[PDB]
Design an enzyme around this catalytic site. Structure first.
Site, mmCIF file in Angstrom:
data_model
loop_
_atom_site.group_PDB
_atom_site.id
_atom_site.type_symbol
_atom_site.label_atom_id
_atom_site.label_comp_id
_atom_site.label_asym_id
_atom_site.label_seq_id
_atom_site.Cartn_x
_atom_site.Cartn_y
_atom_site.Cartn_z
ATOM 1 C CD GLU A 17 -18.352 8.074 2.594
ATOM 2 O OE1 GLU A 17 -18.545 8.824 1.603
ATOM 3 O OE2 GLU A 17 -19.233 7.301 3.028
ATOM 4 N NE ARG A 23 0.801 -1.114 -3.197
ATOM 5 C CZ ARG A 23 0.338 -0.857 -1.979
ATOM 6 N NH1 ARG A 23 1.125 -0.891 -0.924
ATOM 7 N NH2 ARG A 23 -0.942 -0.550 -1.804
HETATM 8 N N1 LIG Z 1 -7.620 -2.755 -2.269
HETATM 9 C C1 LIG Z 1 -6.373 -2.259 -2.443
HETATM 10 N N2 LIG Z 1 -5.278 -3.119 -2.575
HETATM 11 C C2 LIG Z 1 -4.017 -2.608 -2.767
HETATM 12 N N3 LIG Z 1 -3.795 -1.262 -2.777
HETATM 13 C C3 LIG Z 1 -4.829 -0.409 -2.588
HETATM 14 C C4 LIG Z 1 -6.129 -0.887 -2.455
HETATM 15 N N4 LIG Z 1 -6.944 0.185 -2.312
HETATM 16 C C5 LIG Z 1 -6.199 1.311 -2.369
HETATM 17 N N5 LIG Z 1 -4.876 0.969 -2.577
HETATM 18 C C6 LIG Z 1 -3.708 1.867 -2.692
HETATM 19 O O1 LIG Z 1 -4.115 3.220 -2.482
HETATM 20 C C7 LIG Z 1 -4.066 3.934 -3.734
HETATM 21 C C8 LIG Z 1 -5.375 3.859 -4.524
HETATM 22 O O2 LIG Z 1 -6.450 4.161 -3.653
HETATM 23 P P1 LIG Z 1 -7.432 5.357 -4.083
HETATM 24 O O3 LIG Z 1 -6.799 6.679 -3.736
HETATM 25 O O4 LIG Z 1 -8.694 5.125 -3.250
HETATM 26 O O5 LIG Z 1 -7.584 5.302 -5.628
HETATM 27 C C9 LIG Z 1 -2.955 3.248 -4.531
HETATM 28 O O6 LIG Z 1 -1.742 3.895 -4.156
HETATM 29 C C10 LIG Z 1 -3.044 1.786 -4.099
HETATM 30 O O7 LIG Z 1 -1.752 1.170 -4.093
HETATM 31 CL CL LIG Z 2 4.403 -0.652 -0.452
#
Ligand SMILES: Nc1ncnc2c1ncn2[C@@H]1O[C@H](COP(=O)(O)O)[C@@H](O)[C@H]1O
Ligand SMILES: [Cl-]
Ligand SMILES: Nc1ncnc2c1ncn2[C@@H]1O[C@H](COP(=O)(O)O)[C@@H](O)[C@H]1O
Ligand SMILES: [Cl-]
Lengths: 179, 179
Positions: free
Chosen positions: A103, A66
């Site tokens: 986690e 994305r």
């Molecule tokens: N609640 C959410 N809605 C959409 N995408 C998410 C969500 N949580 C995590 N992501 C996806 O996972 C990554 C961010 O998660 P994080 O590594 O926990 O910061 C990004 O690539 C986001 O597109």
């Molecule tokens: Cl996607």
């Protein structure tokens, strides 16, 4: 709606219990689908980056998949190229690997070993910041290429998950904040 | 180099035996990294689409994940929105599924059931056309939303793999052709 931020605000939609129970998925597809919203988002990020870093940015790095939606237009808006940080097994040739067990899941990323030359200054972009696991893994890969990460940015930030903290001292900026 | 096509031609690199033996991987990363090359690619595709379809295109549909690199800028260049066709398990809410088992791998794609309203006219974009399995699966999903696929386009086409044939009668256009 009207202001540039407004045009982005009104183009997020939410899906509960996806991909797992208790998690609210924030979908940026309406932003992509409405050309005014997309242009507003890119403009807001570009103007922040230009005000903040001057002409010191060499590349945007977009996160698969994305972040790939925004990176190229953001780079173009700033007159810069975009480099790619990819999910596992996508890239050919020599790569660096970052595999974090966290986690709530894994952040597993790769970058071509020649994606950047040492000393290059980069801004990372993704759609959304949650725990920061993903962007943190991206910053690790970029640092191992001896790139300097100026800042990470996203459209959406989930503030209860402390992503900003995890990235510090690397600066962070989002357009929209949810819990 | 000079002409617009030249700027794209000189930004493909090739990696042999990836992801499997005998397959030459064509990497569009140099296109993304050189802002002149990227702009040239988007301009060439946009000018073809505008000359070919007039104002009849409603949306660009970008294919996950490398089509995501081009779709948004191509849409923006044409004043249009971009919709997303994604790999398995990415999308929340109701979706349509296309899962093709092909001689050399699978093409498994999904689209949100409300991505488009019936009768909307769409152009599909990806980085590269090989067998056509992927774009063919994308056209299937779009047809099941009663969208009309005007054309599929890519930067690169592998002509020995007969992708154009597989897509016919849906029109096809690429910038660069390799065996
Ligand atoms: N609640 C959410 N809605 C959409 N995408 C998410 C969500 N949580 C995590 N992501 C996806 O996972 C990554 C961010 O998660 P994080 O590594 O926990 O910061 C990004 O690539 C986001 O597109
Ligand atoms: Cl996607
Ligand atoms: N030789 C190749 N180099 C780079 N990408 C490829 C190659 N072959 C297939 N692909 C990818 O797989 C899809 C096209 O394969 P196909 O479905 O056989 O037309 C596109 O999403 C391409 O990015
Ligand atoms: Cl990829």
């Amino acid at each position: 709606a009207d202001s540039e931020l407004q045009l982005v605000e009104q183009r997020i939609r939410s899906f509960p219990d996806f991909p797992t129970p208790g998690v609210v998925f924030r979908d940026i597809s309406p932003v992509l689908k409405d050309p005014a919203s997309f242009r507003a988002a890119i403009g807001l990020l570009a103007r922040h980056l230009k005000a903040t870093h001057g002409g010191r940015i060499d590349y945007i790095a977009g996160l698969d998949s994305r972040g790939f939606l925004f990176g190229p237009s953001l780079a173009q808006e700033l007159g810069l190229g975009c480099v790619l940080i990819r999910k596992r097994g996508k890239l050919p040739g020599p790569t660096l690997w970052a595999s974090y067990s966290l986690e709530y899941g894994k952040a597993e990323l790769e970058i071509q070993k020649d994606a950047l030359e040492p000393g290059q200054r980069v801004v990372v972009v993704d759609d959304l910041l949650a725990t920061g696991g993903t962007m943190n893994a991206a910053c690790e890969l970029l640092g191992r290429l001896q790139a300097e990460v100026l800042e990470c940015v996203s459209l959406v930030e989930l503030t209860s998950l402390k992503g900003r903290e995890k990235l510090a001292p690397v600066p962070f900026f989002s357009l929209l904040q949810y819990e």
